[PDB]
Each structure stands twice: as structure tokens, then as C-alpha cells.
């Protein structure tokens, strides 16, 4: 049993700045015979498979940008990223191969950027859903930062909280923003009892909520 531990669990760094993260092993990974530390680093970008960055603690794999440097020895190892780029958003894992293999628990790197307001769009239920007796209303809140955001649904001017589900994307690898979807699902019978459907987004970028609405009579 070789226990691998990483720190921090997560952090956010602005483009251009330095990133430092740590990996500890419960026993030395320095192989006596070869005089090398059997410790590798992997980068896993959102939605992708892990990719090899560094092995033998400090050897940078071909094709990996030189801003990535592995260091350390024995029980303590460090991955340093200089001049971090938006595309470096990922979970970083260390892995020992001294005795079988074991991964650390990962360090999640987020990218800090300037606050950005969401672009909000609303969509009424499709006729192909209504035909089956259901009515989902969808709101997209796209390209905002930071991740914290509030969405309220109002139906004929009254807030409704039940039947609402939200889902955030991972941070974008190009512009470092988030997006979120909010979907309000009703029955057709209830949908047909009301006219105005509104999604309201409140984000730190404005004291004014962004309001998008449609009226059933206008469909």
C-alpha cells in the first residue's frame, strides 16, 4: 500500500500567473537500482481522457509545453505551471509506479478571469413535446463569470421553484467562462393555465436581473 495525496484539492489562478501543486507519497518513490523517482503527472481536461505530462518526476514528455515542470524526490513532488493559459484548465493527477500503480486524488485547476455577465435566452416547449402531455421551458445562461448565479422562474408574475433543474458546464477552455441551463418542467394541463413564462438571472455583474420571457398567446 502506497498512499498518494495531493494538495490543494482545488484552486483558481489568472492567466499569466504561476501555479504550484503538490504530491506526497507514503513511502519513497526513489528506486535504488535506477536512481529515479517513479512518479508521473497526468492532465485531464474536462470531458477528456488523462494525458501524460511528466514522468520520472521531472522528465517532460515530448509535445508538452515547457511551462509545465515537474520537481521533487523521495516522498514529495511538485508540478509547477508558469504563465498559465486558459487551456490549462484541468484536473492534475500524480501517480506512483514504484510498486504496482496508485493515483493521487487530483488537484482541480480553475482559471480566474474578469467578471462577465451572462447572455440569457428562453425557449418555449416544442409542439412535439406538448403532443405527449409535457411542457419543458428552457433557459440558457451563457458565458458568465464567476460561476455563482441565481435563476428565478416566474409564471404569470409569480415565482415558481418546483420542477426546476439546473446544470452548469465545466469552465470553457478558451474564454474561461461558465454557462448554465435551467429547465422548468410542467404538465401540459398546467402549462395551458398560464400565459407569461419568465426566467430571471441575477449575477454579481449587475444589480439588475436579466429578464427573458415569452407569452403563450404569442406562440
Amino acid at each position: 500500500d502506497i498512499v498518494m495525496s495531493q494538495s490543494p484539492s482545488s484552486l483558481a489562478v489568472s492567466a499569466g500567473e504561476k501555479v504550484t501543486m503538490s504530491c506526497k507519497s507514503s513511502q519513497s518513490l526513489l528506486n535504488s537500482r535506477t536512481r529515479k523517482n517513479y512518479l508521473a503527472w497526468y492532465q485531464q481536461k474536462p470531458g477528456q481522457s488523462p494525458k501524460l505530462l511528466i514522468y520520472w518526476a521531472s522528465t517532460r514528455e515530448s509535445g508538452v509545453p515547457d511551462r509545465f515542470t515537474g520537481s521533487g524526490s523521495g516522498t514529495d513532488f511538485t508540478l509547477t505551471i508558469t504563465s498559465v493559459q486558459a487551456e490549462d484548465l484541468a484536473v492534475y493527477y500524480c501517480k506512483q509506479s514504484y510498486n504496482l500503480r496508485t493515483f493521487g486524488g487530483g488537484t482541480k485547476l480553475e482559471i480566474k478571469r474578469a467578471d462577465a455577465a451572462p447572455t440569457v435566452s428562453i425557449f418555449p416547449p416544442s409542439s412535439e413535446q406538448l403532443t405527449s402531455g409535457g411542457a419543458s421551458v428552457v433557459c440558457f445562461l451563457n458565458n458568465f463569470y464567476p460561476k455563482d448565479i441565481n435563476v428565478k422562474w416566474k409564471i404569470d408574475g409569480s415565482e415558481r421553484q418546483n420542477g426546476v433543474l439546473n446544470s452548469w458546464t465545466d469552465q470553457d477552455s478558451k474564454d474561461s467562462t461558465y454557462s448554465m441551463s435551467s429547465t422548468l418542467t410542467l404538465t401540459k394541463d398546467e402549462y395551458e393555465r398560464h400565459n407569461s413564462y419568465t426566467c430571471e438571472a441575477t449575477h454579481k455583474t449587475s444589480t439588475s436581473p436579466i429578464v427573458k420571457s415569452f407569452n403563450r398567446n404569442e406562440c
Binding site: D1, K95, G106
Partner: protein
């Protein structure tokens, strides 16, 4: 080009068995140890086991977490790696990756497959309903226009969504599925110049492998 492609993932009941495969090309297969690694949704990688290269007699080793229950094997004539899993439980639900491992010298996993997702559950396979998301009575004259597709009520994961067969990749956001009442729902938005829709077609392409569902949904104004 080195390629590793896993197959065999899907829905299986607790207590059941499932065998995964990993087809490889672009390197001398027998020269390499091969590993399996898994990852529960949103959690860490976990090394499962390896099978050694020809020089080391193709012998196997396993993590204590699966030793006695999972078996690794390899077809050295076709360059395919296998993982047999038995007595599956919910904790085994994960993306399974094959990885190229040691060649007798280098200490690294050089290459990884795309992964195959295994779901251990008693719930039944349900294909998605796919609904178009077109603007209602909005201005539309807002320079850009955002369209979407709602992929509702399916099980198990995953689904794939593309737009115009992958030709539209910029300005696409596919929102992670959320589970409710034993069913997943996700949505995908795409943002394009208003000068291109509806004058040009925009179609979402949805697949749900568990039900072999293939859907192409044209977003039509209305």
C-alpha cells in the same frame, strides 16, 4: 498513430458480469504492459491492474480493490486487451480506460483510450425524447442567435450530441446530464450568426448507444 479504443461499456445489473475490450494499433503490442484504470463520475482515477509484456510472460497483477473479482487478458495476435468484471456493484459504475504501460524501461502511461462507461443499476434502458429549442417570439435581430436541443428522459448515460455532424463545434455548450426519477436529462446550446439561420440548416445529432438511438433534429423557425 497510436490508437486505443475501449468497447463494451453499458448497463448491467448488480451481481452481473461484463467484459470490456480495448482495441489497439500503432505500436508493438507485445512489447508493452497494459493497464486498466477507472473513474467514477466526478471522482479520482483508480488503477485496477495490469498484464505484463511478452518478456515477462504476460502475467497479471491487480489492485486489492478488485483482485479475485476482475480478470485481465490479452489477444496478442490481434492486439486487443480485455477486462472481465464479475459480481458487479454500484461502486463499479465508472468510466473504464485502457492505458499503455511499461515497456521494460520507461515508467509512464504513454497513451489512454477514450474510455467506456459502465452503469450498474436495476433501472431499465429508456431512450431519450429529443426536442428542438427554437426562439419563441424573441427579437432574433440580436446579431447572434442561440438554438438548442433538449435530450430528455433517458437511461443510462451516455448520450452524444453534435451540431451539423460536428461541423459546428465553436459556440456549442452541452450541459451535463442531471438524474431525476431514474432518468437523465441534458440540453445543448449552439450560437450562430443570425444571417445563417434559418437561411441555412442547423441540426442536432443525438445518439444514445444503450438504446441504439440515432436522431437528427432540424431546428425550424416557429
Amino acid at each position: 498513430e497510436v490508437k486505443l479504443v475501449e468497447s463494451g461499456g453499458g448497463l448491467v445489473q448488480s451481481g452481473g458480469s461484463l467484459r470490456l475490450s480495448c482495441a489497439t494499433s500503432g505500436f508493438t503490442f507485445t512489447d508493452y504492459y497494459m493497464s486498466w484504470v477507472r473513474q467514477p463520475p466526478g471522482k479520482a482515477l483508480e488503477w485496477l491492474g495490469f498484464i505484463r509484456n511478452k518478456a515477462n510472460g504476460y502475467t497479471t497483477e491487480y489492485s486489492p480493490s478488485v483482485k479475485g473479482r476482475f480478470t485481465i487478458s490479452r489477444d496478442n495476435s490481434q492486439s486487443i486487451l480485455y477486462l472481465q468484471m464479475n459480481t458487479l456493484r454500484a461502486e463499479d459504475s465508472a468510466t473504464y480506460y485502457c492505458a499503455r504501460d511499461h515497456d521494460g524501461y520507461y515508467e509512464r502511461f504513454s497513451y489512454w483510450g477514450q474510455g467506456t462507461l459502465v452503469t450498474v443499476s436495476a433501472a431499465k434502458t429508456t431512450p431519450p425524447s429529443v426536442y428542438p429549442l427554437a426562439p419563441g417570439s424573441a427579437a432574433q435581430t440580436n446579431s447572434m442567435v442561440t438554438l438548442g436541443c433538449l435530450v430528455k428522459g433517458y437511461f443510462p448515460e451516455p448520450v452524444t450530441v453534435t451540431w451539423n455532424s460536428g461541423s459546428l463545434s465553436s459556440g456549442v455548450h452541452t450541459f451535463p446530464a442531471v438524474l431525476q426519477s431514474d432518468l437523465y436529462t441534458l440540453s445543448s446550446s449552439v450560437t450562430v450568426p443570425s444571417s445563417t439561420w434559418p437561411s441555412e440548416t442547423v441540426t442536432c445529432n443525438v445518439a444514445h448507444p444503450a438504446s441504439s438511438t440515432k436522431v437528427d433534429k432540424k431546428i425550424v423557425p416557429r
